[PDB]
Structures are given as C-alpha cells and as structure tokens.
C-alpha cells in the first residue's frame, strides 16, 4: 500500500464524512453531489496532515479539516450565487459543516483554544482580503499574487496551522503553514488557468491577463518555480514530510505542462 | 436605572459590532445595516442578566452580539434581497463569527463548552431552517414547530453560551428556557410586523390569521403560555427579576399593538355576554347589543336591543357583570 493508496483512501474518507453530514442536515441530492465533486478540497487535507504519525489521529484531523474547507467553499458559492443551488440549503449546510468541524477540531487539539486563536488571528486579513479581491480586479502578476495571497495562501495556511495544532507532537507548525501557503498558491493558479475555459472567467483571471498580454508567460513560469522551491523547503524542515515532495512536483508540473500552453 | 443599563449595553454592542464590520472592509451601508439591528444588539443584554461581574457581563454581551449579528447577515445572504453586496455580507458574516468564537472561548469556564453548545443541536437548527423554507406552515401547530428551530433553538443556544461564559451563579437551564420562550414571542412579533413592512405571505403567521387558517384566541393563548414560561425561568434562583418587566413589555406589545392589525372587529375569541333573569326569564345578551349602562350602588343597570325598534331592560350585580360591560360604564 503506497502513498497514493493512502491519499486515495483519505480522499474517499473525507468525501463520505462530508456527504453523510450534508445529507443528515437536510442537504438535497444536488447539494450532496455538489460537495462530493469538490475533489481537490477533499484531497488537500491529506497533504496538510502528512506530519501526523498516528494513523487514527491523522484520519480524524483530515476529515475535520475537510468539513470546514467544504464549508468555506459553500459560503463562497453562496456569495457568487451562480451554482443554481438553493441558497437556503447552501447557507444552512455551510453553517452545519463548519460547526461540526469546530467541534471535531477542538476535540483533537492539544489546547482547544488554539483552534479559535488560529481562526481569529488573521481573520481580518483573509476576509478583508476577499472583499478587496472582488472589488478591484488584478491587472498584472504583482496584483494577482497579492490577491491570491489572501483567498489562496492565507486561506490554506490557516488549515495548515490547524493541522499542526490538532496533530500531536512532531509537528513543525511554521513549516506546515509555509507548505500550505506555497502549495495553495500553485493550485490557485491552476484553478485560475482551468476556470478561464470551464467557467468563462475573465476579470482578474490570470489566464485572461496572460492572453491579453498584461502578464508574461516566463514570469508565470518563474512564480511557479519559486512556489515549488518554497514548498520543497518547507517539507524538508525537521521532522520532515518527504511524502509531500512528489506531490509538490506533481501539481507544479501539471500547471507547467498542461495548463500554461493553453494560454500562450 | 436598569433601562439606562439596557440602553448603554445596546449602544456598547452597537459600537463593538460596527467597528468590527468597518475594520474588515465593510462598506458604510453594511455598517448602517448592522447598527440598525436594535433588538439583536440588545438581546445579549437580556441573556447576561444573571452575570454578577459587570466587566464580564459587558464582555460576554458584546461577543454574543457579534455572533447573533453574524447569523443575521448569513440569513440576509440566503434571502439575498437587502440590496447589500454579497461578498461583503459573506466575508463580514465570517469575520464577526470568528471574533465571537474567540471572545466567548476566552470567557468560558470550559474550553470545549462553546463548540459543544454550537454543535449539540446544530442539525436541529440548520435542517430546521431548511424545512421551514421547504414546507411553509399552514396552521398554528406547524407555525410553532418551525418557529421553535430558527427562533427558540437559535436564541436558546445564545442563552446557554451566556451561562457558560457568565461565571458563577448562572442557572443554565433557566437562562436557556428564558431565551427560548422570549425568542418565540419576538418571532411572532416579527411575523406580524413583517407581513406589511416586508410584504411577507407564505408561512407568515399574520397571513395565516387573515386567511382564517389560525384563530386569534389560539395566538393569544400561545403568547400567554410563552409569557408564563419566560416568567418562570427568570424566577428560578438566583433569579433575574429585572427581566420581568421586559417579558411583559414584549408580550403586551404583541397583544395590544400587533394582534389587532390582523383581527379587526374585536377578534378576542368569543363575543362577551351578560347573563341575568328578567321578568322571570333566563337571558344572556351580547355586549354588542347593549345600549346604555349606569351604576346604582353595586348594581349595574342597562338597556339593549332585542330586535327592531325593540328595547330590552336589565340590571345585574357588578360581581356578575363581565369586564366589557363594566368598561362601557366608565366609557359612558
């Protein structure tokens, strides 16, 4: 049973925990299906908990993170209001998942207070950040990175910290977070470059800027390499999560090989 | 001087909430929106009435205000009809909520008590709201069952948190029982107000009333029951007697100001009567047929309409005169 097998089982475990929860609180089939389709969001908790040595604790933190991450995703669907889903269900399920995650995370934390500490610390940076992002669309790679640094980096960074706080000892908290923030930016770029065609996104979309000439391909390549480097270093800090090395390369290379050509 | 503490508390909560909304990038409109949530901002004052230390009281009160407002913004977001920016609503909703969790947890006796309370009946609350909007109520029974989740359970949770964060001398079950009863009274008032302020119809209690699906007397009975439940809760030792006039104030406002807008010609249940023996006969007349009425010692003498230009006559001991009759005495 290799790492991929662990990952695949973690992702399915997170998905089941999430859908069971959506269903029991009144979620409709379309809403349950919608959450089951948030693949990477369901997968990412597995990478964030790679430093956790007890398999049971790891599975429990992983699914708790998945509940809140899906929750935040639904809140995001609710503000964009473009999924066709019922706003009442979206709101209620969003709240319900979130509260269950708080409960599960706190029952796993060394200090229950650490969970709300982490969620509040940069709550202003994250929420004020999302507001500004949708307010003024980016016009160059500098502005794009600045924005993605909040809804992407700070957003996953928090779950990084939560994973270290709920993961017991042998957790280099700052590195887990560094990893999460650099990895989050790689995948946010990926999303941007996939959602241009799948969603028809334009304003502030990195793909659009690439096609309209406001952003050079080489600079995008450079940023990706800087992010890869940052992630690799984070996972090499002691105790170390060598299992994340190939994951960093996988997602980075996918953007370089599959996604960039689509826009140049 | 409790009315003054109440106003200062609401103003303090208003201050804390608005500054927090603005600090996160909330626009002036959104700030004005939250400052306008007067009862939401004041209610935390009612919930912390049992708190002996004033500094803790003020701290718990504002944290509750933070989350209650947050939930209100979440509600505005699901209806999406305030005209406010959805991104701001969402992000401010989250920020306030996270701030409340932090403040509440810093005051709780136990580290897990806050999330224990929010999770315990999270499903009842969340699925409850979903079902409320999925199947609009068609009679008082259904109306009450729905109202028990988004109103009672909703506020009851904040009652439990107030006790959990309010130090010693907090009769947990009672603070919460008060919250759940008071929330329902407020919820009915909301329905009977928003029928016209908002033009609400489906599942709306005022609409059900006007429609004939719900009887005024039943609404009156429910209000009295709720008044009674709230009064019992605040009488539990150590007690919060200060809440007594607050309970009557809201219940009475619904009974005197709002109910009549949806009933009309004395929808006070059954038409009051006057019983008496006249000319050997057994008679009962509807107060509505009664013409003149005057007092002679302890007897109440009166006239009424029998049918046509016909005028009835009668007198009864004031001890047997219905309230309605006695009022006509003063009104004449």
UniProtKB/TrEMBL annotation, chain B:
Protein encoded by which gene: moeN5
Gene3D superfamilies registered for this protein in UniProt: Farnesyl Diphosphate Synthase
Protein name stated in the entry: MoeN5
